[PDB]
Amino acid sequence: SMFSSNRQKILERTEILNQEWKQRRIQPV
Amino acid sequence: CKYSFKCVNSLKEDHNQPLFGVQFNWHSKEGDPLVFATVGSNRVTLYECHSQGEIRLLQSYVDADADENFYTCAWTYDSNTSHPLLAVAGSRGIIRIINPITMQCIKHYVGHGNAINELKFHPRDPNLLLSVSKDHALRLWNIQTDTLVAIFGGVEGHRDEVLSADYDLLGEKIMSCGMDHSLKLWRINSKRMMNAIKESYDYPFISQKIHFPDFSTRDIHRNYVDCVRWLGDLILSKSCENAIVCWKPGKMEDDIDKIKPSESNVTILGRFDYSQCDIWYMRFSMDFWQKMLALGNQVGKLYVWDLEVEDPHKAKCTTLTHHKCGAAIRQTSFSRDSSILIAVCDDASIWRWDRL
Ligand SMILES: COc1ccccc1CN1C[C@H](c2cn(C)c3ccccc23)[C@@H](N(C)C)C1
């Protein structure tokens, strides 16, 4: 389906963003 | 939908003026405190979320100009020092980069003509800031070199105020929307744009003047399009017609990266219906994983949908209501882990909803 395909795109792409955030150590505010 | 929330706290800012924006800082590392910013009048305020619904006031920014009215804010970080940063803008058309640790202005950018309605940071490059304005244009800034990379408008640009814009997940393209009823696509992974961005880092800087979008439609809504966000290769957009519309440029099977600038087709996949949100300038938001969609209405109700349930009517969550929350919810923000949801109102009130 269009839904499941789009869901996997979101999943794959948010995982890429999540991995980039994990390597980061942004100092606390 | 499986999601449930409990209202654990609320407060009201002493200025009593409407709050237009709220954003949790999604750059803060795991374990660090959940911090959000609010914007309204000439104020920017930072709060920290603690246990048992505690909302701890951190610092208040009060703009020298009493006539300034902030409409939006967005978070970023310094690519070199890992220092958090906060961009704000409003009616004066001035972008202010604020050190959220000291609550002092680092730098500002005039550039834009008229009111700035929304700010957004690129999801990959923390220096690329997008401002959308009352002057009908979008502007891309490189805040590391203090250059205006590109101006998106002109011959085939918006014909009225740009109200909202969003970068897709990988930061390859932007969807803008506004008072002219249209939604316009602007590709930033084009050779021209990728080179203009590269040049902004090598830098009087010559900004790109992008007169032509990569897609344009005015057949989704019959009024002002006041909010827009990507959902994968699909779009989420709303007007004042009591629905958020899920659609895609072109025909059902058309790949987002294969649609041509003159593409006349548009495909609606669904609608997330609600009630009493028939007034202009009401923003919707999603959590980081795009599993939840939230929208406040003019009467203090907070609607939530489970984006993992295909049928939007079946996706509906129990609507969040508190007998003391009766004012228009202008914007909402989920914490990075979606355990906390904050709503801000026209009566300067702030509402904290914790995941059950
Ligand atoms: C909550 O803000 C949203 C939400 C969605 C899209 C854009 C905005 C930003 N707006 C700020 C402006 C505004 C000024 N005043 C006094 C207002 C009172 C109430 C509501 C909005 C405004 C608006 N212009 C076009 C008139 C656009």
Numbering used by the authors:
A (entry chain C): 40 to 68
B (entry chain A): 78 to 280, 288 to 440
What does the article say, verbatim?
Polycomb repressive complex 2 (PRC2) is an essential component of the epigenetic machinery, regulating gene repression primarily through methylation of histone H3K27, which leads to changes in chromatin structure and thus exerts influence on key biological processes such as embryonic development. The minimal core PRC2 complex is composed of three protein components: the catalytic subunit EZH2 (Enhancer of zeste homolog 2), the WD40 domain comprising EED (embryonic ectoderm development), and the VEFS domain comprising SUZ12 (suppressor of zeste 12). EED contains seven WD40 repeats and adopts a canonic β-propeller architecture with the ‘top’ portion for H3K27me3 binding and its ‘bottom’ portion anchored to the N-terminal helix of EZH2. The recognition of H3K27me3 by EED and the resulting increase of the methylase activity are believed to be crucial for the cellular function of PRC2 in propagating the repressive marks at the chromatin loci.
To elucidate the binding modes of EED396, EED666, EED709, EED162 and EED210, we determined the crystal structure of EED in complex with each respective compound at high resolution. The crystal structures were solved using a EED-EZH2 peptide (40–68) complex, except for EED396, which was determined using apo-EED. As illustrated by the biochemical results, all five compounds do indeed bind directly in the H3K27me3 pocket. Refined 2Fo-Fc map (σ = 1) showing the two rotamer conformations of Arg367 in the EED-EED709 complex structure. However, they exhibit significant induced conformational changes for residues Trp364 and Tyr365 (with a movement of the respective side-chain of more than 5Å), moderate changes for residues Arg367, Glu238, and Met256, and minor changes to residues Phe97 and Tyr148.
